């Protein structure tokens, strides 16, 4: 994708003022360097590929850090985690996608599981990550029958194994994901994207049977968009995020602080 060349320009004395316009119209000016100055002929050679959406959004970033603290006391009763999937909990990723009103893409998920040794050894640890779409039974314990995964997709990782990874196709029941939603429940509740963005949960359990080593397992989840499309650009988020699915920005006993830096006097740059 090529940037146009800067053409040669000469001294003009004319009735048409390309520099003069009306921005009241809501249209951006069309003035190029050649219209305002006696320009030199330069052969520009820049591709714009890296500025494409595929390039911009097609990078893996963290969207969730799942901590499983293995308890040896009630081994089968606990030792599992549940997380309602979404891209609203980590700022770097969230801000990039919210530059658009609607987005559509496939997802690549890469998992980075880290075992923290709290005993002399870690033994042999194996984890199971299961995707539970809305409506499927959510596991209630480490030994829940739902872990049989008769039809849900599960992925297994054992100590020593490379980072797991798999793709998910565009999941919505609509034609695009809603990055913003000016609407409600059928009950006039839950303003926002909580209504529209119900992708189910990601559940995990330590598969290895009762053992004697305390460990904590932190699995960070990375998401990368593939084959991306987006519509209706929006201004970038100017303040810290406080909640998922809400554009709220007020923090208790703290003033609104944007990234604009003030200066003493506007006649000094």
């Amino acid at each position: 994708l090529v940037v146009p060349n800067i053409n040669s320009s000469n001294p003009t004395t004319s009735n048409s003022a390309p520099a003069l316009d009306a921005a009241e119209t809501g249209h951006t000016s069309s003035v190029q360097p050649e219209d305002v100055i006696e320009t030199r002929y330069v052969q520009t050679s820049q591709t714009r590929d890296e500025m494409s959406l595929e390039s911009f959004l097609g990078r893996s970033g963290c969207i969730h850090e799942s901590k499983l603290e293995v308890t040896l006391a009630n081994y089968n009763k606990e030792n599992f985690t549940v997380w309602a999937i979404n891209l609203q909990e980590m700022a770097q990723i969230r801000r990039k996608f919210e530059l658009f009103t609607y987005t559509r893409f496939d997802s690549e998920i890469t998992l980075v599981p880290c075992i923290s040794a709290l005993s002399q050894d870690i033994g042999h640890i194996t984890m199971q990550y299961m995707y539970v779409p809305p409506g499927a039974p959510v596991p209630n314990s480490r030994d829940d029958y739902a872990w049989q995964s008769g039809t849900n997709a599960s992925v297994f990782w054992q100590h020593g194994q490379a980072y797991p990874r798999f793709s998910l196709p565009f999941l919505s029941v609509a034609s695009a994901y809603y990055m913003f939603y000016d609407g409600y429940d059928e009950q006039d509740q839950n303003y926002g994207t909580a209504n529209t963005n119900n992708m189910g949960s990601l559940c995990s359990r330590i598969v290895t049977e009762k053992h004697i080593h305390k460990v904590h397992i932190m699995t960070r989840i990375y998401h990368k968009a593939k084959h991306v499309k987006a519509w209706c650009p929006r201004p970038p988020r100017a303040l810290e995020y406080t909640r998922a699915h809400r554009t709220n920005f007020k923090i208790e006993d703290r003033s609104i602080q944007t990234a604009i830096v003030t200066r003493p006097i506007i006649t000094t740059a």
């Binding site: 994708l1 591709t47 590929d49 494409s52 595929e54 390039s55 097609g58 496939d106 997802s107 793709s167 998910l168 196709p169 565009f170 593939k226 084959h227 991306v228």
Partner: peptide, 25 residues
């Protein structure tokens, strides 16, 4: 098939398109 680059080899190995790598611009 083979593609040029900003020449390299590339074919899809899986049956679902979601599996494919980044899109060509």
């Amino acid at each position: 098939a083979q593609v040029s680059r900003q020449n390299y080899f590339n074919i899809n190995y899986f049956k679902d398109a979601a599996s494919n790598g980044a899109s060509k611009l």
